[PDB]
Amino acid sequence: SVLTQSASVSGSLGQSVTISCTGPNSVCCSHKSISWYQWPPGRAPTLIIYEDNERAPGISPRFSGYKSYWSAYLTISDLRPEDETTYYCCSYTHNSGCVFGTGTKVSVLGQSKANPSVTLFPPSSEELQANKATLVCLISDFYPGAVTVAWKADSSPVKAGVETTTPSKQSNNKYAASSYLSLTPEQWKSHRSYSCQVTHEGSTVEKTVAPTE
Amino acid sequence: VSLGFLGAAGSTMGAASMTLTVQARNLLSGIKQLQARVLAVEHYLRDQQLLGIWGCSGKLICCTNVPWNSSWSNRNLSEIWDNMTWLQWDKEISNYTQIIYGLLEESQNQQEKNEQDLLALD
Amino acid sequence: VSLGFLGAAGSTMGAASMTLTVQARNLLSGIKQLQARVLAVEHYLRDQQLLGIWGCSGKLICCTNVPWNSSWSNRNLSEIWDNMTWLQWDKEISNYTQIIYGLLEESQNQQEKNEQDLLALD
Amino acid sequence: ENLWVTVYYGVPVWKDAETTLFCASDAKAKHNVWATHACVPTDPNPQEIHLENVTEEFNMWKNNMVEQMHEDIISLWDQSLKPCVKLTPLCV
Amino acid sequence: ETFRPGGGDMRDNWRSELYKYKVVKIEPLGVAPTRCKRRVV
Amino acid sequence: EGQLVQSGAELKKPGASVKISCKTSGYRFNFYHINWIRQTAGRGPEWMGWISPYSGDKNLAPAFQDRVIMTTDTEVPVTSFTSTGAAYMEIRNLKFDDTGTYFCAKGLLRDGSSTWLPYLWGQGTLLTVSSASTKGPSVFPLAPSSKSTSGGTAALGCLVKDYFPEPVTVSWNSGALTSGVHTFPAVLQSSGLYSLSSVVTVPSSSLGTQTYICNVNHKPSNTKVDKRVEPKSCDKGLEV
Amino acid sequence: AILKCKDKKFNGTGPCPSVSTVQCTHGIKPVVSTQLLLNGSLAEEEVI
Ligand SMILES: *[C@@H]1O[C@H](CO)[C@@H](O[C@@H]2O[C@H](CO)[C@@H](O[C@@H]3O[C@H](CO[C@H]4O[C@H](CO[C@H]5O[C@H](CO)[C@@H](O)[C@H](O)[C@@H]5O)[C@@H](O)[C@H](O[C@H]5O[C@H](CO)[C@@H](O)[C@H](O)[C@@H]5O)[C@@H]4O)[C@@H](O)[C@H](O[C@H]4O[C@H](CO)[C@@H](O)[C@H](O)[C@@H]4O)[C@@H]3O)[C@H](O)[C@H]2NC(C)=O)[C@H](O)[C@H]1NC(C)=O
Ligand SMILES: *[C@@H]1O[C@H](CO)[C@@H](O[C@@H]2O[C@H](CO)[C@@H](O)[C@H](O)[C@H]2NC(C)=O)[C@H](O)[C@H]1NC(C)=O
Ligand SMILES: *[C@@H]1O[C@H](CO)[C@@H](O)[C@H](O)[C@H]1NC(C)=O
Ligand SMILES: *[C@@H]1O[C@H](CO)[C@@H](O)[C@H](O)[C@H]1NC(C)=O
Ligand SMILES: *[C@@H]1O[C@H](CO)[C@@H](O)[C@H](O)[C@H]1NC(C)=O
Ligand SMILES: *[C@@H]1O[C@H](CO)[C@@H](O)[C@H](O)[C@H]1NC(C)=O
Ligand SMILES: *[C@@H]1O[C@H](CO)[C@@H](O)[C@H](O)[C@H]1NC(C)=O
Questions:
Q1: Are residues F94 and F142 in the same domain?
Q2: Nearest atom of ligand 1 to the alpha carbon of F53
Q3: Domain range enclosing F31
Q4: F76: which strand partners?
Q5: Measured between CA atoms, how close is B97 to chain F, in angstroms?
Q6: C-alpha–C-alpha distance, residues A27 and A99, integer Å
Q7: Do G25 and E21 touch (CB under 8 A)?
Q8: Do F24 and F99 meet the contact criterion of CB atoms below 8 Å apart?
Q9: Considering its fold, how many domains does chain C have in total?
Q10: Alpha helices of chain B — where are they, by DSSP H?
Q11: Which among B39, B53, B54 is the top mutation candidate for probing chain C, defined by the most C β-carbons within 10 Å of its own β-carbon?
Q12: To pair with B108 at 20 to 30 A between CA atoms, which of A168, C41, D82, F25?
């Protein structure tokens, strides 16, 4: 897209943060109104700002807009956990539709740490009949939203059949993710135990299952 | 454009506010007829009476000193004047019209004239 | 304090003059009824007619160019406004109201408009 | 950001109301009960004004124009009977 | 579903032609907020 | 203060056509433009066009001017100030990069300098463009596992493995159980099939008075699965 | 004022989308009748 936003910006808790929105004169500011949207992934967006300064109904006064001749800006004051998400600007006139920007992901620093919740499930007996074997390692309520997952077969790494999802934001403003390990029934039965290790820069957690029990 | 009497009843309040003379013209112009004609001039003189006590007799629009209490409506300028019709507006402000009219005669005109006497007293 | 319609009929003229809107509201709002309603709007329009020819249509109080001839009453500001009621005042000025009304339309409004034409003539 | 109330006179606003209507018909050349001696002549042209975007609820069954017309026809019938010959002696 | 014609009441005849019309009273007084103030005393 | 409800997700083969609907309520449908916006992984969010239910004037972005047809029905009145309506978008010559999420959105103001500006958005419609066929999921129980031994809490769920395409909806006790539900996003296997998991946290003491049933709906394949989660755990910490 | 519903398929009460206003109705003939209605106005499109 020819309408560029700051790819990332960061602000501290209780502080303010500013997102930029600029591009060529063919799309930018003097003769074009600018609007701002909050757009969480996987959900419907919310209009916060339209016509430059003027904020949408019900929007808190924490949000403010400003447009210069060369670029436009959006300021979010008194940052909250829910403000940590993706934001888009649009350039438009009355008769001409939206041109969406490249997008900006906002990170809120100074937030409290959340301990990870790890749960590991073995393959079902109905699944062992099929005959396949999939271990499921579910992770929730961790912050910041970044994980690294490692699997082990009899205390030794595994590399075939590992699939891990990206981290996803929970309704409670914590994060979640999951990982799946596909195995053949012989590898499952031929080992003493399997393990799912979730590593975070602050703490590494290990959950272990065994085919014996 | 002139759309006629009540032509902008279904337009936005801002668009309708431009053609107040249109509604104003036809607003004034045996026993059944006579009783009806009396009722008509009676209602017209009632509204002109209210414009009188609000100091706005000769004008269609006048500004006031009463501030807009946000409890009445939480909308803004753009949302009121470019998204709503006078009809649905009058329905939303149907709990305050009596209240607002009372504040309208008292807050300003009942104090505009007292201050006028104390000011022109020299 | 708001004492109601005619609440300050028995107060001093100065105190009563503050609540003219109170008397003004209720001043406008089968055969017997209909004839009564016509009589009401007829009297109201008569007073509004007199305010018209005195150039005071939209106001409750207006000042004039007619000087106070001392033959009318020999009282002063303090004696009139802080010692008398509008009732006993109207009784004292019951020989001049016709006369004062005639001077009121002629002395000022019948010459305010002529001078207005000769002034706005350029 | 400081808002003050403003008066508008002549706004397109109406409310449901019941009032006394009256008759109207073009003048013709006699003496039919409904027209009576006099009913106000119609305007040469009525102005039917379309109201774009306007949606109003109608109720033909709770309508008062019906009850008014009903009593009008009845009363007109009696007004036309008074001056004519009453056949009280015809009960022989 | 059996149908019989009736004429119980004479108003129904007026309803047949007055179904389309409705009476309303004009309330020409509207108050709305703007960023305007009257000239200060 | 109205709701926009869009049609369900669809899987279509590339080169085919699909018609998405957008039913409205809670406002005068005639008074606001209906915009259509999509979001794909390759191009991000992209505005497609809008149409006026009152006049029928439409404005399509040049990238979709030759492949999108927008139409509207006439509003069905409910009260004097509200009504119900429906708008449609028919998109043809589908390609793989057209896979994504599509939204309809109600305009901002009846008049002004941004009348059409999308303000009220629908829940979205998931469109998958692929040569691959629809595939139903296989549902397996997730035996209860201990969450807090001292607190007496546990977690149990259902595993939805190998389905295609997105999405799958999961409820508990026919929607009676909504508290403590945590449904996880799907994984994208190398085979091209999706798989996800759902877990609910409940007190460990609740075993003799409450039934836990996970209801899986995969509407693209028209399959419903009601699986009873076995409450007997194998976790020692929960066994205590 | 009088509001006139011009909705053809108007089923006897309800919201009328197309409405026009008049000070006086059209010429209504006071036909005294029973059962069948005589010399009246005809509904357009479908019978109502
Ligand atoms: C009854 O209710 C309805 C709905 O509530 C209401 O209709 C809305 O009315 C409002 C205001 O009256 C309109 O809001 C304005 O719209 C102006 C016109 O829009 C222009 O742009 C349209 C898109 O143009 C693109 O697409 C076309 C192809 O379609 C292409 O050729 C163009 O180049 C461009 O790419 C266009 O379709 C539209 O054309 C229609 O209207 C014109 C008359 O304007 C007519 O000639 C056409 O035949 C056609 O019907 C038109 O060109 C818009 O310009 C305007 O913005 C200006 O004014 C504001 C101030 O109001 C300024 O701030 C701003 O800077 C601009 O100068 C404003 O946005 C709205 O569009 C209507 N439709 C809706 C909401 O769907 C009725 O008015 C109501 N009627 C009554 C009697 O109450
Ligand atoms: C009875 O119905 C006939 C039609 O069957 C009516 O005749 C038409 O009257 C209209 C005026 O309303 C004319 O425009 C048509 O040209 C007439 N039709 C024909 C075929 O000439 C007649 O008016 C009705 N009588 C009434 C209502 O008393
Ligand atoms: C719009 O309304 C909200 C709600 O009261 C208000 O807080 C806000 O300041 C208003 N915004 C504008 C741009 O006028
Ligand atoms: C505004 O409305 C509130 C109702 O909660 C009332 O208490 C208050 O006195 C009002 N304010 C003014 C200035 O009239
Ligand atoms: C008017 O008052 C009644 C009862 O006090 C309430 O039900 C109604 O919602 C009020 N109107 C508005 C517009 O708030
Ligand atoms: C005042 O009244 C007296 C009565 O004695 C009269 O002669 C005189 O003309 C009046 N003066 C004015 C200025 O009207
Ligand atoms: C009014 O005039 C009569 C006779 O001219 C006189 O008796 C009376 O006292 C006058 N009124 C006043 C207040 O002087």
A1: no
A2: 76
A3: 1-131
A4: F84
A5: 20
A6: 8
A7: yes
A8: no
A9: 1
A10: 13-16, 20-25, 31-53, 77-81, 86-92, 97-103, 110-119
A11: B53
A12: C41
